[PDB]
Amino acid sequence: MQSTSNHLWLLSDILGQGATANVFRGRHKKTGDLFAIKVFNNISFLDVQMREFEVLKKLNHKNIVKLFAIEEETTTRHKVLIMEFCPCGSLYTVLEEPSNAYGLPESEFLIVLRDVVGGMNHLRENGIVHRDIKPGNIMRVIGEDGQSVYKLTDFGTEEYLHPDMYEVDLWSIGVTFYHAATGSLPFRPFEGPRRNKEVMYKIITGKPSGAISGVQKAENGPIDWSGDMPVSCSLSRGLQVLLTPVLANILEADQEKCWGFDQFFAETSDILHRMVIHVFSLQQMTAHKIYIHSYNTATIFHELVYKQTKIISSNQELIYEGRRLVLEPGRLAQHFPKTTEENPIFVVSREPLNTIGLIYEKISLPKVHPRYDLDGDASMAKAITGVVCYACRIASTLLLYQELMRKGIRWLIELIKDDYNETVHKKTEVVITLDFCIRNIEKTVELGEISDIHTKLLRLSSSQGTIETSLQDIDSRLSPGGSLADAWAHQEGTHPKDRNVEKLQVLLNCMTEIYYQFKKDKAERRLAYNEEQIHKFDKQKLYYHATKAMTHFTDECVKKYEAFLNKSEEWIRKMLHLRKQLLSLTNQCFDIEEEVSKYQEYTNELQET
Numbered sequence: 001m002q003s004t005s006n007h008l009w010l011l012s013d014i015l016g017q018g019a020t021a022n023v024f025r026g027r028h029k030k031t032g033d034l035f036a037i038k039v040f041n042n043i044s045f046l047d048v049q050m051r052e053f054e055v056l057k058k059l060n061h062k063n064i065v066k067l068f069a070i071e072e073e074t075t076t077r078h079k080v081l082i083m084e085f086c087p088c089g090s091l092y093t094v095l096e097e098p099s100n101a102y103g104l105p106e107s108e109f110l111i112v113l114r115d116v117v118g119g120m121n122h123l124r125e126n127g128i129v130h131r132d133i134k135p136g137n138i139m140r141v142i143g144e145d146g147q148s149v150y151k152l153t154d155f156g157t158e159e160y161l162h163p164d165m166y167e168v169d170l171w172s173i174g175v176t177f178y179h180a181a182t183g184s185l186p187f188r189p190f191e192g193p194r195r196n197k198e199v200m201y202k203i204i205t206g207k208p209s210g211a212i213s214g215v216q217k218a219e220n221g222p223i224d225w226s227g228d229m230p231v232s233c234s235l236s237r238g239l240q241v242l243l244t245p246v247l248a249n250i251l252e253a254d255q256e257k258c259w260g261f262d263q264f265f266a267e268t269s270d271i272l273h274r275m276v277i278h279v280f281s282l283q284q285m286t287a288h289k290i291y292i293h294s295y296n297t298a299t300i301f302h303e304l305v306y307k308q309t310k311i312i313s314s315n316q317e318l319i320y321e322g323r324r325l326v327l328e329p330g331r332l333a334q335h336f337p338k339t340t341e342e343n344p345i346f347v348v349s350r351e352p353l354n355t356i357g358l359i360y361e362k363i364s365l366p367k368v369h370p371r372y373d374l375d376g377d378a379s380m381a382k383a384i385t386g387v388v389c390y391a392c393r394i395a396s397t398l399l400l401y402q403e404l405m406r407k408g409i410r411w412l413i414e415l416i417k418d419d420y421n422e423t424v425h426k427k428t429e430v431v432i433t434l435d436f437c438i439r440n441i442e443k444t445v446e447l448g449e450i451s452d453i454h455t456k457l458l459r460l461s462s463s464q465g466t467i468e469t470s471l472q473d474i475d476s477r478l479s480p481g482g483s484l485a486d487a488w489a490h491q492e493g494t495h496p497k498d499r500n501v502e503k504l505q506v507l508l509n510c511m512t513e514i515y516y517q518f519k520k521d522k523a524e525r526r527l528a529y530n531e532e533q534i535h536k537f538d539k540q541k542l543y544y545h546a547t548k549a550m551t552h553f554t555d556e557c558v559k560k561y562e563a564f565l566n567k568s569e570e571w572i573r574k575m576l577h578l579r580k581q582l583l584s585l586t587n588q589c590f591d592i593e594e595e596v597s598k599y600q601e602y603t604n605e606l607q608e609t
């Protein structure tokens with residue numbers, strides 16, 4: 001409960017403690033405006049210090065916390081610093097939440113990388129060495145437009161250190177972005193870099209120079225490597241493709257072949273300056289995100305789709321808002337239509353495509369031990385709540401996929417019907433032409449060319465008539481009740497009416513409440529006898545919520561998703577066969593449309609002076 005000239009803070013409002021100064025929740029005394037006070041009790045060693053802090057006062061930027069003033073505590077004469085209060089916490093705080101247990105959401109990851117790189121660029125423009133970049137050293141405030149604003153705070157932890165040290169600037173940034181991407185750290189021995197400290201350094205130094213992750217699965221065991229994000233990471237493959245190279249080449253200890261800052265700020269800005277176009281491969285039931293600059297063309301856009309789904313350019317037939325897209329190779333990306341996850345561009349290819357659907361990592365979940373270990377129960381509750389939160393994220397993605405298939409199929413049928421009606425238009429164009437050449441030849445009536453041409457027109461109507469029978473049978477399929485009807489799609493799956501996502505999130509909210517309370521029990525050390533009781537019963541309720549939610553996820557979701565997906569393969573096959581027939585019959589209405597007139601403009605018109 002110390003005080004100062006201005007400002008004042010309570011001692012129970014301690015938010016962070018560490019080397020030298022702690023950080024409290026202070027006020028302004030004259031006003032009730034909140035502040036963050038750095039106490040600085042250990043004023044060891046040594047004018048120059050107040051000057052190297054006076055420069056920190058003037059420096060103003062969106063991605064840094066601001067030092068407002070320095071003051072002297074009343075009773076102890078300790079150098080206290082007032083700073084911008086960040087009510088949301090730090091980047092490590094949001095990485096503690098089970099929603100980010102397997103990685104930040106895609107949009108908020110862009111907010112992190114934007115604000116982090118922008119803040120470090122502004123610091124290097126003034127020459128402020130940070131080096132020790134950490135999620136704890138990255139705070140979060142809410143912007144005036146909601147959103148989020150991340151700000152650096154401490155400049156001028158062993159887990160985020162370069163190999164040359166660990167007892168060189170871009171190493172910490174790579175480990176933080178990987179931690180933010182997948183919700184887990186890279187380079188991990190067996191259960192933290194604790195006693196396996198010598199194991200950790202063996203992982204950090206001597207790296208395949210192209211990988212990003214290292215992890216052993218057993219005690220004193222082997223280390224697996226990978227140059228890609230894991231399957232569990234909830235980040236679009238359209239973003240991992242251009243995010244892997246920057247990580248794999250800044251985490252290389254060889255300073256000869258490591259990105260400088262100018263190249264780091266160049267590749268990162270390239271990522272941030274792009275826009276996203278949502279594309280759902282209907283034939284494969286896979287959603288995608290194309291990260292493409294606003295000045296690029298549609299040709300490179302089709303190439304980026306080929307890089308994800310292996311669909312050949314110019315064979316990619318695009319659907320949007322129930323209509324075909326018919327894009328041009330010169331149109332800029334900033335002129336494309338809007339794209340959301342719930343309104344993505346659908347993609348067919350007229351070729352047989354392997355339907356794979358969504359690929360997610362099975363977890364199988366952890367066990368709860370009857371041991372009363374509080375810190376063990378806290379760390380266990382954090383992992384298991386992130387697991388069921390992963391199942392909710394997968395369940396919402398599988399529901400989106402099913403509903404998007406229903407929309408893309410419902411449009412695709414109404415698109416085939418339009419092409420079917422266009423073929424009928426060209427059919428009657430040949431019919432009326434065939435009628436006006438038959439009744440004209442039969443009106444005028446050696447004479448061998450008369451019967452020859454007449455029987456040739458009889459051959460035209462004979463093939464044209466069987467084309468009509470084949471078309472009306474095709475419509476009999478497109479008609480309700482027959483094949484290719486989008487009737488099964490309204491069944492066999494899950495719908496927002498079933499509210500499976502909400503049935504899982506109510507148990508997820510009960511879990512995260514128990515987990516938040518278990519983390520409070522960690523700070524309280526020993527608990528009261530009654531609080532020990534409720535900690536035990538809620539510990540068992542965590543297992544009951546897990547068994548009930550996970551069973552509802554595997555028996556309602558997934559299982560019905562597999563049935564809807566297995567039947568989607570059948571309808572896709574029958575749809576490709578339908579479009580192959582209707583296209584061939586449409587071509588048959590074009591060559592015989594040229595066979596007439598040829599047998600009308602000529603051969604019926606003779607000459608005479």
Ligand SMILES: CC(C)c1ccc2oc3nc(N)c(-c4nnn[nH]4)cc3c(=O)c2c1
Binds near residue numbers: 015016038085153
């Ligand atoms: C949820 C808890 C853990 C919380 C909430 C708000 C916070 O708000 C902060 N605002 C600051 N300006 C600084 C700071 N660190 N170094 N300099 N200022 C630290 C914090 C917190 O730790 C914090 C924690």
